Curated annotation (Swiss-Prot):
One of its GO terms (cellular component) is cytosol. This is Dihydrofolate reductase. It comes from Escherichia coli (strain K12). Belongs to the dihydrofolate reductase family. Substrate binds at residues 5, 18, 43, 48, 104. InterPro entries: DHFR, DHFR-like_dom_sf, DHFR_CS, DHFR_dom. Gene3D superfamilies: Dihydrofolate Reductase, subunit A (3.40.430.10). It comes from the Bacteria. One of its GO terms (molecular function) is NADPH binding.
Amino acid sequence: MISLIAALAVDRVILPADLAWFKRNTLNKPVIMGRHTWESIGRPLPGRKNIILSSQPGTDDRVTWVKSVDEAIAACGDVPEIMVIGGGRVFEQFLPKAQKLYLTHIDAEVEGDTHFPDYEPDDWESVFSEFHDADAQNSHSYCFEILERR
Ligand SMILES: [Mn+2]
Ligand SMILES: [Mn+2]
Ligand SMILES: [Mn+2]
Ligand SMILES: [Mn+2]
C-alpha cells in the first residue's frame, strides 16, 4: 500500500519532533522522492531503499532511478508499505494511488514555494491524531495525523 508522508506548515507549505516521527514511519520501508529532494539529503536515507523519480538518467548508483510512477511502484516489489516523501509535484503524482497520509501539521508560517497537494478531505478518514504544544525544543505546536483513504 502506497503512503505519503510530509510536514505541512501554513498553506500546506512543505520542529525536531518531526524527525523522530519521519524516521519511525519510514524505517525499513522503500522511500520514493523527487530529484530536487534527492539533491537535498545528499546521501541515501540509511536503512531504506531510496528510489528517485526523474525523467533524466540517473547520476548516482547508490539509489534506484526510475522515470515513471508505475516504474517506481514496481521497483519496490511486494512490500507491506511504500513511503513517498516528496516533493510537491511527486506527491501530486502518487496521491491518486495513495491509501495513507502521514501529515505533521505545524502551526508555522514559513516562506515556501512548494505545497502539499490539495487533497480532498471528504475522501480521507482521520484514523490517528496526536496534538503537541510548543516547548523548549519545538518552537511551534504540531499535530501528528494519519489519514486513510475512504
Ligand atoms: Mn551502471
Ligand atoms: Mn507557530
Ligand atoms: Mn504575517
Ligand atoms: Mn500543553
